């Protein structure tokens, strides 16, 4: 089981009790997609939902 990591590009505070707080530069272990625009992941031990359009694209 190898890792699937991504990097937060923009901060985000939760609007529902299942959501993660995102801080710029945070590295999330991705679980999967739940809905358009919404992924589940693990960040600092907590599993929760986060907006996928707040994640940094890899462009070199």
């Amino acid at each position: 089981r190898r890792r699937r990591r991504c990097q937060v590009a923009f901060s985000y505070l939760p609007q529902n009790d299942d959501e993660l707080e995102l801080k710029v530069g945070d590295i999330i272990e991705v679980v999967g997609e739940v809905e358009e625009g919404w992924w589940e992941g693990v960040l600092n031990g907590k599993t929760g939902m986060f907006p996928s359009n707040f994640i940094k694209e890899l462009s070199g």
Partner: peptide
């Protein structure tokens, strides 16, 4: 700032 999409689905 980006805009989050609407949500309906949860675990």
């Amino acid at each position: 700032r980006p805009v989050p999409m609407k949500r309906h689905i949860f675990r």
